[PDB]
Amino acid sequence: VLYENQKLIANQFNSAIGKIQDSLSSTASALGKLQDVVNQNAQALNTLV
């Protein structure tokens, strides 16, 4: 099933990677956990000051 149908897998895989890079280019809300961690640490530090 691979060896009879691999080029469509190639186009789907490359188009899906392009979909991911478009999704990361469109929104910054995918990295909300990391931004939440950084905001939590900076919030705790500013709270300490």
Place this chain on the structure above:
Amino acid sequence: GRDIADTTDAVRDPQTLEILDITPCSFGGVSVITPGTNTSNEVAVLYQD
């Protein structure tokens, strides 16, 4: 002046109206980089910040 966290970052001189930044006096923790005292007594000091 004031910084983000209620810190006096800048002052203006009263005799002559000049704006002076207050960089804090530079300070940091002293650490000792050493191997075991069973091996040697030569130490290396890493000054941070």
